[PDB]
Ligand binder design. Structure first.
Ligand SMILES: *[C@H](C)[C@H]1/C(=C/c2[nH]c(/C=C3N=C(/C=C4\NC(=O)C(CC)=C4C)C(C)=C\3CCC(=O)O)c(CCC(=O)O)c2C)NC(=O)[C@@H]1C
Ligand SMILES: *[C@H](C)[C@H]1/C(=C/c2[nH]c(/C=C3N=C(/C=C4\NC(=O)C(CC)=C4C)C(C)=C\3CCC(=O)O)c(CCC(=O)O)c2C)NC(=O)[C@@H]1C
Ligand SMILES: *[C@H](C)[C@H]1/C(=C/c2[nH]c(/C=C3N=C(/C=C4\NC(=O)C(CC)=C4C)C(C)=C\3CCC(=O)O)c(CCC(=O)O)c2C)NC(=O)[C@@H]1C
Ligand SMILES: *[C@H](C)[C@H]1/C(=C/c2[nH]c(/C=C3N=C(/C=C4\NC(=O)C(CC)=C4C)C(C)=C\3CCC(=O)O)c(CCC(=O)O)c2C)NC(=O)[C@@H]1C
Ligand SMILES: *[C@H](C)[C@H]1/C(=C/c2[nH]c(/C=C3N=C(/C=C4\NC(=O)C(CC)=C4C)C(C)=C\3CCC(=O)O)c(CCC(=O)O)c2C)NC(=O)[C@@H]1C
Ligand SMILES: *[C@H](C)[C@H]1/C(=C/c2[nH]c(/C=C3N=C(/C=C4\NC(=O)C(CC)=C4C)C(C)=C\3CCC(=O)O)c(CCC(=O)O)c2C)NC(=O)[C@@H]1C
Ligand SMILES: *[C@H](C)[C@H]1/C(=C/c2[nH]c(/C=C3N=C(/C=C4\NC(=O)C(CC)=C4C)C(C)=C\3CCC(=O)O)c(CCC(=O)O)c2C)NC(=O)[C@@H]1C
Ligand SMILES: CCC1=C(C)/C(=C/C2=NC(=C\c3[nH]c(/C=C4\NC(=O)[C@H](C)[C@H]4CC)c(C)c3CCC(=O)O)/C(CCC(=O)O)=C2C)NC1=O
Lengths: 159, 160, 322, 161, 159, 161, 161, 161, 159
């Protein structure tokens, strides 16, 4: 969360929280209620977001759902969708936290290694996240969408 | 063990302090709550058997565990899990009375993850079963005492 | 086993039919397929196959127990969910199936005996079936209860006990086969010293003499071992006092030390300088430790005077997590 | 470390559950308390030097400790003791903002007893100093903030003792 | 405390709390408010109780504060009074707990051994506690005094 | 580390004895096995990534461990577990070439139990994974090689448990 | 512990599958070997004392071990070593009847390494003794039985080393 | 345990050597010291309670430890600490008679550090108490005995630290 | 040793050494110098004692050194003599220690089991020790011989 990040920087510097840092915390607590609503919206639309994004991804990448491809077959396709769902849940957590750190520890560290063992293509996963972003953006109001976009972009950058 | 009265005492003796009003306030609070906690405990004892069965149904039952190659599978395995759910309930009730979380971890939380990992029992499922016990308990208990009763359940859940 | 395999193979190929007839029979009171609903029906179909698959296993195994454990609790679980009768009626069909499949009377019979076990539990009431003991504790170590089926599944525990028999003379004399008497002693030696002390070829002469005759009890024998010179030096003398009380737990009571308050009570016993004792048998000290354990109600109750202490374990008495 | 917001998140993540209204309510509760906490933290930071001074005056100084043969005798030891006091204060402030005692366990409390015993620092005196700081802090922060501040100070004290 | 004792008995039996046990808990919580007041009274009068009891003890036992005696000298006399204060604090703890257990752990176990090493006479200590009881009784109302007396008596019995 | 050849030498060196026919026979035994071992090692190295994948598929994945609240849940933990698997495989291959279990004791086995207990990693599941790797390896190496390969895998498993 | 029959059953039970004929054939194979195993076990029990004597003569005695400063020097240590030899023999016989190596792992192999290291007992010498017992046993049991007997002896040896 | 006489014997036994004059001289040395040691032991036993009292007065009592929040605060803890002091005294007396430090290692020293660290008992303070006992003991025993007594006290101190 | 035994009994009782126990220690230390001389005498005569005893044993038991017998052959006869030498060394250790414990640990525990595996007859071994005693007694003065005899007798009893 924002507060954890601020504390950690202070501890490294071995100083009390700076006034500026404190001000940012104040802003965050005010923003939180709005953030909660944004997260709630995405949670309700979660099932549809995943479904729509999946379809887009498969259209964008025929290969992944092909006999050679990792995603091919019902079991595999379900797992690919489950992964998309996981990332969406992480994004919601991020929005409420106001930081990517929660997202980062659960999803972005060791992700390359995990997927390489699985043999899943990382770029395709990124495309799926991008697809989810577009669906999510449409349901969200513009300013809400921008907030959500940042977290989505981070995920795409990470993979 | 330690309960809310003795906890306040124990913090004061280490400081060597006689009891202050601040301490006397915490003690008063326990005594106000206490009367209904006694009522809520009796409710939970009577309906315990039912509470467990409902909880199992919501989470444990109709899961992969029930299917062969899961822990629930077999009558023997099924029985054990129920015993564990009965354990979680008695302690949570004991914790509700007293009003101190610690009774929980001395008797339950200390060592549990290590046994479960050794036996092969899945930690997540147990956590789900505990959360289920919480919802059932809350209804029986009624709204005022539910907040109280929910705390001890949540402690157990995060411990695991 | 070889023919048992053949019997199993016959049962396996006709199994689907065997299940079907039992199912068709019931799908006493007869219950319609539809009111039950698909899931409950699906469960019932699974259950029939389940009894049968265990039966095949039970044949191969050649033990009633596998079927025994699972059937017991199952009858309790069923009732609100299921009619007790329908399950019964099912075996009527399958035992008839069993008789038909195997022409050898004995082959059909053994298959019947496995099916009989399943039925016999179902027939037995929920009340008739007995709940397993719950290990008791005083003010520390919460009381834990174990399920019986769990205890049944676990391999049976061999108990070595020698019981003093009253005589017309009024001096106790104990009757055992030459091998059988001394076998208790062999295991006692082995429990306390954690290894058999015959391969070293020392053992207390007078200890064992008295138990063979039967005047000093086995409980009193294990007492005599702990106090013995052999028991220290092997244990006690090489350890620090805090470690000795932990090993002395394991061999004298079969459990590990379960709480902070007990390891403290016992640490004060072994620590405490003896009150001077008239008995030349050295007063208290570590002997106090050993007394306190045998004299403990937990000891006497679980083991009794006849039994030699055994190691309680996963199978028995539950076993605590902390 | 952990904070209240992250604690809620972590509990949900182990369940795998999406955030729900009940969870949201807990988060909302924290957000209301947050404003008070931030004000308290700013007060403490500004008055940190004085808080330490006052607390030392109340318990540590003008005592056998400061006199020769006492643990806080010599400049080096005196400076160390006030540095330790500052640590306790800073961490308690961090904990108060976080709303969680975990940071205290992870940084301050872990291995402190053993360190102190090797050093020969007196634990009970240190605890006394922490309690003194709490009293001074309580005044400055004001009553609503004081209750929140006190729990973290007490947590430190209990750990050390 | 009463509640701990009840829970512990239940746990040994491995059963939920009996109705009778529950009733005793109910009675205790009702009594608690009265108990708190009794404890509060003694805390406020603590300084005077100790002072008065000390004087009585020293009159009763000249020897303890004599060149031979342990208590003799200002330093030693202070320590003797500190001990009396400690026991009073323990008694207050007992009253709120409704049980002697809190008192017992802090003060009554190993007390003989500690005092024997110190060479302090145990009977004199007991007299001091008795003296404190008399002072405390006077300030307390009769019913309150009876409650307080039990805890005081226990201490005297223990030493 | 030690190997078979060096083990024989070391035993003789402590005795101070010159190498004798009985010793030579043990060495000769190793030399015959050697060629097989070299072939097995090359097979394992080429298929190492797949071996790990297959073993994980057999035991670790599609399980509670991978599900939220399981030890191998989260990418970080998943990556750690597969890293450990690779270690075990590499060391087992080394041991097979060497003909001695000692390297496993000196590198892998020493302190692993304690590390795992602190981490809260489940030993039994890890053992399961090692056994799974063994099965996959057995197939690839072929029967003669499999017997030799199996003993080192079993050694690792016994150490952990 | 586990036996061959139960091992097959357990694998099938987790799958939920009724026993396949191929699985049944493996069970059938075991049942035929069982008659021979029982005969072998009786031979070993009768000749156990001699087996140990011969094996000791082959490896342990007339050696530095028995000489002063050696591990098996003093009557107490000598007696201990032959007791251990008997254990290995008895457990191997149990394993042969069972048709499964698991009992060796559960009872003998678990904690042995640690015990030996604390005692300073030499593992390689012990392994040598086990191998010697195997050779003696092989003779008495006869060829068909010997192959079965050998695998369990080898399993013990591999575990210790 | 071991004593000086047995220590000489054991050293010879591992060599397998018969007792020789040089060995005899060491034994003879012990025998002369013996009479002094016996007298010292009797002195210590009679004055044991006082020795502990004096040592506590020198180091433990009138300190943070005895003050609330200190390790020796509460009657139970006070009693425990003096019990530990008595242990050290009794064992040191045993060692002095024996003429060997081994008993201290076998009973007192082994695992004490770890126990104390878990308990949070302060080791340095305990060592201080041991040193204090040594000083008191030195006076009572007299100079010749004191040198012998001191080594065992120092041995305990070094072990704990 | 005597002293070790006394200490061990005290430690079991968890008490300081008793006056009586202390007295026995005093007596032992006085005796030690005499004991050392007795041991020295036997050590010097060791080679001859073993040789003479061996001859006596072989005369007493023709069978042991016969083709059937264990002792038969040069290698075997040497080993039998080596065993006799071992026992003599143990006896000397015992005399200086003043206790059989040193002897007992090295030689008497598991002795039956060891010899039974070897198939050596235990009674013959005992005869050899008896023979050694007689030779040793002759060289020793009467009072010295009595002391030595006790240790020799113990060995004979043990086997
Ligand atoms: C109802 C008249 C018919 C029927 C259906 C049915 N079964 C259950 C529940 C269970 N059945 C089992 C199965 C077994 N476990 C064992 O150990 C054995 C013995 C080999 C069997 C057969 C178990 C354990 C359960 C409980 C949980 C589960 O689903 O696994 C139900 C529902 C009751 C519930 O949910 O508890 C129903 C409707 N079984 C029959 O044979 C009847 C003809
Ligand atoms: C005199 C030239 C200046 C002065 C001094 C002053 N000091 C104090 C208080 C303390 N000074 C010390 C210093 C030391 N303690 C040590 O261990 C060492 C090294 C050996 C030193 C030099 C300490 C510990 C104290 C604290 C109080 C105590 O005694 O425990 C004061 C008064 C306290 C206060 O400031 O309120 C003063 C006045 N003051 C000046 O202005 C002079 C220039
Ligand atoms: C007064 C009624 C009697 C008396 C008292 C006396 N006490 C001491 C010294 C100590 N007494 C204590 C006692 C306690 N510490 C605890 O933890 C508790 C329970 C909470 C008690 C009651 C302690 C620890 C001490 C040791 C010194 C210290 O504070 O560190 C003394 C002086 C000791 C001395 O002999 O020098 C005295 C005199 N003596 C009497 O004769 C009175 C009857
Ligand atoms: C979909 C966008 C792409 C895809 C996905 C895919 N994934 C798997 C299998 C797994 N993926 C995960 C990932 C996670 N576990 C976590 O804990 C997290 C963060 C919370 C993630 C992201 C895991 C663990 C698995 C393994 C299965 C399991 O969990 O039990 C598959 C199947 C792989 C296989 O062949 O077994 C697939 C197909 N595949 C693509 O190519 C898409 C672009
Ligand atoms: C002579 C009185 C009789 C006799 C002797 C004999 N001994 C052996 C072989 C061994 N003897 C020992 C004994 C000891 N080892 C010890 O550590 C001790 C205590 C200090 C003793 C007494 C041992 C270990 C052996 C094994 C061989 C070895 O030294 O490595 C033999 C050889 C026979 C055999 O090896 O089976 C013999 C002949 N036997 C008689 O017949 C005499 C009556
Ligand atoms: C003989 C081949 C080698 C040898 C053996 C030896 N062992 C010990 C001591 C012990 N051995 C064990 C081992 C076991 N206990 C069990 O339960 C099992 C599995 C069923 C085994 C194998 C134990 C526990 C001990 C200690 C107990 C005891 O009193 O013996 C010794 C004695 C070591 C000592 O000095 O104490 C010896 C000599 N050593 C060799 O030299 C041979 C190569
Ligand atoms: C006194 C000089 C210091 C001191 C002592 C102290 N010790 C304990 C508690 C225990 N002490 C031991 C240690 C031993 N185990 C052994 O085997 C031996 C040698 C034979 C010793 C010395 C043990 C096992 C305990 C725990 C038992 C129990 O809890 O009753 C305490 C009490 C600590 C507690 O929390 O209970 C104390 C106070 N500590 C000091 O402050 C002195 C410097
Ligand atoms: C007082 C605190 C306490 C706890 C909690 C405890 C747990 C506990 N659970 C056990 C077993 C068990 N526990 C479970 C439980 C479950 N399997 C699942 O999949 C479910 C999610 C879950 C419960 C719903 C099972 C199945 C076993 C039997 C082990 C097996 O053979 O799989 C055992 C082994 C005891 C025995 O069965 O003999 C213990 C110690 N014991 C204690 O003392």
């Amino acid at each position: 969360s924002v507060l954890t990040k601020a504390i950690v920087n202070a501890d490294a510097e071995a100083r009390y929280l700076s006034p500026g840092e404190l001000d940012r915390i104040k802003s965050f607590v005010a923003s939180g209620e709005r953030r909660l609503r944004i997260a709630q919206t995405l949670t309700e639309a979660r099932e549809r977001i995943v479904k729509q994004a999946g379809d887009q991804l498969f259209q964008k990448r025929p290969d992944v759902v092909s006999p050679g491809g990792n995603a091919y077959g019902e079991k595999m396709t379900a797992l690919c969708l489950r992964d998309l769902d996981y990332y969406l849940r992480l994004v919601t957590y991020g929005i409420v936290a106001g930081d990517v750190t929660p997202i980062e520890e659960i999803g972005i560290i060791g992700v390359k290694e995990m997927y390489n063992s699985l043999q899943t293509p990382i770029p395709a996963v990124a495309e799926g996240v991008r697809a989810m972003k577009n669906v999510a953006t449409s349901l969200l109001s513009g300013d809400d969408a921008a907030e959500a976009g940042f977290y989505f972009d981070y995920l795409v950058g990470a993979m | 063990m330690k309960d809310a009265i003795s906890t306040v005492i124990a913090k004061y003796d280490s400081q060597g302090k006689y009891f202050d009003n601040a301490a006397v306030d915490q003690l008063k609070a326990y005594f106000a709550t206490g009367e209904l906690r006694v009522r809520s405990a009796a409710a939970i004892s009577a309906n315990a058997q039912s509470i467990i069965k409902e909880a199992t149904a919501k989470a444990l039952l109709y899961s992969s565990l029930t299917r062969t190659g899961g822990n629930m599978y077999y009558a023997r395995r099924f029985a054990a899990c129920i015993r564990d759910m009965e354990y979680f309930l008695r302690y949570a009730t004991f914790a509700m009375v007293a009003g101190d979380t610690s009774l929980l971890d001395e008797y339950v939380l200390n060592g549990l993850k290590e046994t479960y990992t050794s036996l092969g029992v899945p930690i997540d499922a147990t956590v789900k079963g505990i959360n289920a016990l919480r919802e059932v308990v809350a209804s029986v208990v009624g709204p005022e005492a539910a907040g109280e009763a929910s705390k001890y359940f949540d402690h157990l859940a995060k411990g695991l | 086993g070889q023919r048992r395999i053949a019997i199993v193979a016959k049962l396996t190929e006709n199994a689907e039919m065997i299940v079907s007839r039992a199912a068709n029979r019931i799908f006493f009171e007869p219950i319609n397929i539809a009111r039950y609903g698909p899931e409950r029906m699906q469960k019932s179909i699974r259950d029939l196959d389940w009894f049968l698959r265990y039966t095949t296993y039970a044949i191969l195994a050649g033990d009633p127990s596998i079927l025994e454990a699972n059937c017991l609790g199952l009858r309790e679980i069923l009732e609100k969910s299921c009619s007790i009768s329908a399950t019964i009626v099912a075996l009527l069909e399958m035992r008839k199936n069993a008789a038909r499949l195997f022409k050898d009377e004995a082959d059909s019979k053994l298959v019947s005996s496995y099916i009989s076990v399943v039925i016999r539990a179902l027939d037995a009431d929920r009340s008739d079936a007995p709940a397993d003991i719950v290990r008791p504790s005083s003010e520390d170590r919460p009381g834990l209860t174990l399920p019986y089926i769990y205890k049944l599944s676990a391999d049976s525990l061999t108990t070595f006990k020698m019981t003093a028999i009253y005589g017309a003379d009024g001096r106790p004399k104990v009757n055992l086969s030459s091998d059988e008497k001394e076998r208790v002693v062999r295991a006692a030696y082995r429990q306390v010293f954690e290894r058999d002390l015959k391969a070293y070829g020392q053992s207390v002469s007078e200890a064992e003499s008295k138990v063979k005759n039967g005047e000093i009890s086995v409980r009193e024998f294990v007492r005599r071992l702990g106090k013995s010179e052999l028991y220290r030096r092997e244990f006690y003398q090489p350890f620090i006092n805090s470690r000795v009380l932990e090993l002395a737990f394991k061999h004298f009571l079969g459990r590990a030390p379960e709480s902070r308050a007990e390891v403290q009570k016992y640490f004060s016993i072994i620590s405490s300088p003896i009150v001077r004792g008239q008995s030349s048998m050295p007063s208290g000290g570590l002997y106090a430790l050993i007394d306190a354990l045998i004299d403990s109600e937990e000891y006497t109750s679980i083991f009794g005077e006849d039994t030699v202490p055994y190691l309680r374990n996963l199978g028995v008495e539950a076993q605590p997590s902390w | 470390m952990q904070d209240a917001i992250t604690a809620v998140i972590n509990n949900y993540d182990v369940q795998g559950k999406y955030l729900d209204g009940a969870a949201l309510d807990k988060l909302k509760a924290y957000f209301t308390t947050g404003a008070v906490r931030v004000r308290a933290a700013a007060v403490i930071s500004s008055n940190a030097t004085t808080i330490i001074k006052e607390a030392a005056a109340k318990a540590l100084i003008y005592s056998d400790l400061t006199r020769p043969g006492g643990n806080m005798y010599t400049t080096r030891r005196y400076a160390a003791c006030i540095r330790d006091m500052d640590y306790f204060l800073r961490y308690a402030t961090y904990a108060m903002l976080a709303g969680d005692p975990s940071i205290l366990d992870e940084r301050v409390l872990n291995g402190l007893k053993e360190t102190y015993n090797s050093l020969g620092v007196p634990i009970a005196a240190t605890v006394g100093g922490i309690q003194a700081m709490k009293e001074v802090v309580g005044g400055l922060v004001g009553p609503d903030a004081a209750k929140e501040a006190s729990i973290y100070f007490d947590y430190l004290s209990s750990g050390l003792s």
